[PDB]
Amino acid sequence: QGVDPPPPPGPPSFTGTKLVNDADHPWQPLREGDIRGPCPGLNTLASHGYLPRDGVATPAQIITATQEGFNFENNAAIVATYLGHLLNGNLVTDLLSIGGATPKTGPPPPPPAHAGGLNVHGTFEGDAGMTRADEFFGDNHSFNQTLFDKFVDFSNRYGGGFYNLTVAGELRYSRIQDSIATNPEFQFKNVRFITAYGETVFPINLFVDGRVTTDRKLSMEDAASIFRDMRFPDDFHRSAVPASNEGADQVLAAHPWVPGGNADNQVNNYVEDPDSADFTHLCRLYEFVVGSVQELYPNPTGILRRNLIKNLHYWWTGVNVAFGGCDELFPYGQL
Ligand SMILES: *[C@@H]1O[C@H](CO)[C@@H](O[C@@H]2O[C@H](CO)[C@@H](O[C@@H]3O[C@H](CO[C@H]4O[C@H](CO[C@H]5O[C@H](CO)[C@@H](O)[C@H](O)[C@@H]5O)[C@@H](O)[C@H](O[C@H]5O[C@H](CO)[C@@H](O)[C@H](O)[C@@H]5O)[C@@H]4O)[C@@H](O)[C@H](O[C@H]4O[C@H](CO)[C@@H](O)[C@H](O)[C@@H]4O)[C@@H]3O)[C@H](O)[C@H]2NC(C)=O)[C@H](O)[C@H]1NC(C)=O
Ligand SMILES: *[C@@H]1O[C@H](CO)[C@@H](O[C@@H]2O[C@H](CO)[C@@H](O[C@@H]3O[C@H](CO[C@H]4O[C@H](CO)[C@@H](O)[C@H](O)[C@@H]4O)[C@@H](O)[C@H](O[C@H]4O[C@H](CO)[C@@H](O)[C@H](O)[C@@H]4O)[C@@H]3O)[C@H](O)[C@H]2NC(C)=O)[C@H](O)[C@H]1NC(C)=O
Ligand code: HEM
Ligand SMILES: CCCCCCCCCCCC(=O)O
Ligand SMILES: [Mg+2]
Numbered sequence: 316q317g318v319d320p321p322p323p324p325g326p327p328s329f330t331g332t333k334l335v336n337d338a339d340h341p342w343q344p345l346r347e348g349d350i351r352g353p354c355p356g357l358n359t360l361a362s363h364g365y366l367p368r369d370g371v372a373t374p375a376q377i378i379t380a381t382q383e384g385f386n387f388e389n390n391a392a393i394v395a396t397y398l399g400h401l402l403n404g405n406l407v408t409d410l411l412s413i414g415g416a417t418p419k420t421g422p423p424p425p426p427p428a429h430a431g432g433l434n435v436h437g438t439f440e441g442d443a444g445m446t447r448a449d450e451f452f453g454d455n456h457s458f459n460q461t462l463f464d465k466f467v468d469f470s471n472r473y474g475g476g477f478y479n480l481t482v483a484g485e486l487r488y489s490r491i492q493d494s495i496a497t498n499p500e501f502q503f504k505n506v507r508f509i510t511a512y513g514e515t516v517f518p519i520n521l522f523v524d525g526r527v528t529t530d531r532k533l534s535m536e537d538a539a540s541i542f543r544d545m546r547f548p549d550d551f552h553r554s555a556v557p558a559s560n561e562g563a564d565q566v567l568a569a570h571p572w573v574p575g576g577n578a579d580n581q582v583n584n585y586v587e588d589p590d591s592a593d594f595t596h597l598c599r600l601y602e603f604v605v606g607s608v609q610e611l612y613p614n615p616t617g618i619l620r621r622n623l624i625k626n627l628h629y630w631w632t633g634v635n636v637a638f639g640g641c642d643e644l645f646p647y648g649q650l
Contacts, residue, residue: 318408318409322629326557331555331556332526332552335363335385335547335553336547342363343368349368350412350417352433352434355541355542357370359546362546363384365380371410371412371419371420374400382557385521385553393629399433402439403431403439405420405423405430406622408420412433415456420432425612428612434456436455438604440507444462445466446462446542447459447462449494449501462490463539463543469482478535480566484569484570487570499581499584501582503575504575504592505574505592506600508591512560515566516562516563520561521553521558526555575588598641601634602644605627627646
């Protein structure tokens with residue numbers, strides 16, 4: 316009949332480094348029905364049992380898992396999780412797939428809402444990823460060895476054989492160029508424009524062992540373990556502090572870029588979108604997403620309406636802090 320969704324967890328009581336690849340959280344292979352998707356962080360958490368091993372979880376579980384497993388900062392966890400949930404989760408059962416569609420999220424929502432999981436392309440998941448191919452090429456969720464080979468190449472060329480912030484700057488730009496040249500449906504706007512810079516530093520801030528204090532750099536062995544195998548490095552210790560997108564500004568600065576996309580179903584035809592969110596116009600992202608939610612849920616009532624209102628408020632609490640203040644929207648009024 317429905318769940319009453321609780322407010323998000325706050326930061327963990329203990330925020331220092333610790334062993335996260337421990338005896339209680341062993342890597343285990345996929346079973347039938349287990350879901351994995353485009354996020355190596357969530358994938359690894361599920362394969363080590365920080366999340367349900369089937370890859371279906373509540374927002375609350377996802378937040379706590381990203382904190383426990385990686386020391387993902389609380390507000391960043393809230394912004395990412397409720398974004399994912401609002402667009403791609405089942406608001407009634409309070410369950411989100413970290414990958415594709417599954418009966419495990421429960422009775423489907425009214426169309427055009429889908430609860431189809433983080434795999435759904437075009438509003439959250441998008442193009443020019445590091446180890447995943449653009450949806451246009453037919454698979455936006457699987458690890459892609461050719462792309463990981465480029466990751467290794469760029470690490471060799473710019474990072475001494477390791478992934479560091481210099482490499483991030485170069486790889487991000489190059490991957491944008493690849494999509495311009497090869498993908499006629501390439502989009503790099505709104506949510507994707509913002510998340511694409513954060514994701515390039517997460518390997519440095521979160522996949523590098525927390526006992527490394529200076530010269531933070533990720534080995535290709537550790538990268539492959541997480542990105543491909545969904546496995547923590549042996550004896551992996553999380554970041555010694557809550558962290559998220561530190562250094563993403565410098566990635567952009569290395570190759571200034573403007574939100575937009577290839578126009579008119581043609582390659583090498585990138586047109587700027589002046590209405591898109593960008594890093595000095597973050598609240599546009601809030602407004603865009605609320606708009607998208609209204610398209611998914613044009614006239615909700617009952618538990619669905621209630622759970623939408625709550626989840627929108629939950630998300631806003633994170634957005635308000637992370638974006639430095641946005642006016643809360645109330646598309647369905649109040650409870
Ligand atoms: C990601 O990982 C990558 C890979 O590890 C990493 O890249 C390293 O980046 C650092 C910088 O961040 C590199 O170090 C810098 O190198 C600068 C350039 O070095 C060249 O030029 C030096 C200066 O040249 C002057 O003097 C010569 C005459 O000697 C003259 O011709 C020039 O015109 C100019 O006037 C030169 O000394 C240097 O040569 C020495 O070193 C090389 C080896 O690199 C050696 O072969 C030579 O025999 C000689 O010993 C070289 O040709 C350098 O300028 C810069 O120095 C700054 O810091 C010093 C203090 O240490 C200051 O005194 C100085 O004023 C500068 O401000 C610095 O050392 C490093 O070499 C990279 N490593 C690799 C593997 O490429 C990224 O940093 C990582 N990214 C992140 C964010 O972590
Ligand atoms: C893993 O990920 C990679 C990268 O996303 C995928 O490989 C790409 O596959 C696409 C589709 O097959 C390739 O697209 C085609 O590229 C041509 C240009 O290629 C050259 O130039 C690029 C850089 O500019 C190099 O990376 C590449 O090595 C080549 O030297 C274009 O000419 C093609 O355009 C035609 O098709 C499009 C789409 O219909 C039309 O819009 C055009 O008008 C035109 O008719 C085309 O876009 C792409 O080159 C591949 N890249 C690489 C690096 O291989 C893998 O498929 C993916 N999968 C796995 C499992 O590996
Ligand atoms: C907190 C909730 C999280 C959500 C909802 C989430 C969601 C996503 C999604 C949808 C993508 C694909 C983006 C795209 O294709 O445009 C992605 C990619 C990524 N996520 Fe997560 N993520 C979360 C937490 C984390 C954490 C904690 C980490 C690291 C510890 C992480 C690291 C990454 C990285 C590195 C990528 C990029 C993979 C690539 O480009 O190859 N995420 N995430
Ligand atoms: C100052 C930058 C604020 C960053 C807002 C990012 C919005 C959602 C983040 C999702 C990150 C991820 O892919 O895990
Ligand atoms: Mg993608």
